[PDB]
């Protein structure tokens, strides 16, 4: 899963108030759509993952249906948000 | 804010998969209503707080409108969930 250094950097130190586009799998174009949806910060998006009880099918359908992310980009957000939770939750 | 030892214990160690009724301010009766609302775990409720951008007025209206918590019990959840985030987020 050739994730960018952001995936390891994200699960290597707190998220603080970093921008949504900072989450692995979310690019600048996708971060803009979530931002227009009321998610101007990554911690708001991690909240959605927690609300879905880590349901991978509900999360991927939610992200894809919410912005159009591909099956591939959603996998990076699932493991990226989920691994952060494993070290942090 | 005479919060029970649960408030300090909650922000003193990870939350893990502890039951919703474990959050400070949420009693067994209130934990049952959130549970019927799809929040069988505390980490699902913390997610709601993250989705509301810590908006105290939206959070208190949501918890009160969702279960009927009093202005008093919602204050314990706000500072309790918010302080956990300060140490864990």
């Amino acid at each position: 899963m050739t994730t960018s250094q952001k995936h390891r950097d994200f699960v290597a130190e707190p998220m603080g108030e970093k921008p949504v586009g900072s989450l692995a799998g979310i690019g600048e174009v996708l971060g803009k759509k979530l931002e227009e949806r009321g998610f101007d910060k990554a911690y708001v998006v991690l909240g959605q993952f927690l609300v879905l009880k880590k349901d991978e099918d509900l999360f991927r359908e939610w992200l894809k249906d919410t912005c159009g992310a591909n099956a591939k980009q959603s996998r990076d957000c699932f493991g990226c948000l989920r691994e952060w939770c494993d070290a942090f939750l």
Side-chain angles (χ1 to χ4, degrees), chain A:
Chain A
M1 347 210 271
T2 40
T3 63
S4 201
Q5 264 174 324
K6 294 180 180 191
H7 170 98
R8 290 187 199 285
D9 290 340
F10 190 84
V11 302
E13 49 170 17
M15 43 154 61
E17 290 180 350
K18 289 182 179 193
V20 59
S22 181
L23 296 167
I26 308 306
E28 294 192 0
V29 174
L30 298 172
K32 239 199 202 65
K33 297 180 180 256
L34 296 160
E35 181 176 41
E36 223 180 271
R37 291 281 204 172
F39 295 86
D40 63 340
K41 300 271 167 133
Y43 78 77
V44 184
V45 171
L46 170 69
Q48 191 68 67
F49 180 74
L50 301 175
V51 173
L52 299 176
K53 286 180 268 204
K54 316 182 201 266
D55 260 319
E56 183 175 353
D57 290 346
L58 300 177
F59 178 87
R60 295 193 307 189
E61 231 182 345
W62 170 83
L63 180 63
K64 180 178 167 149
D65 198 320
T66 301
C67 68
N70 291 35
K72 192 170 172 139
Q73 303 200 304
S74 70
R75 288 197 183 205
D76 290 340
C77 290
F78 180 90
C80 177
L81 297 170
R82 184 176 188 216
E83 286 221 337
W84 183 93
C85 282
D86 290 335
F88 286 108
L89 195 74

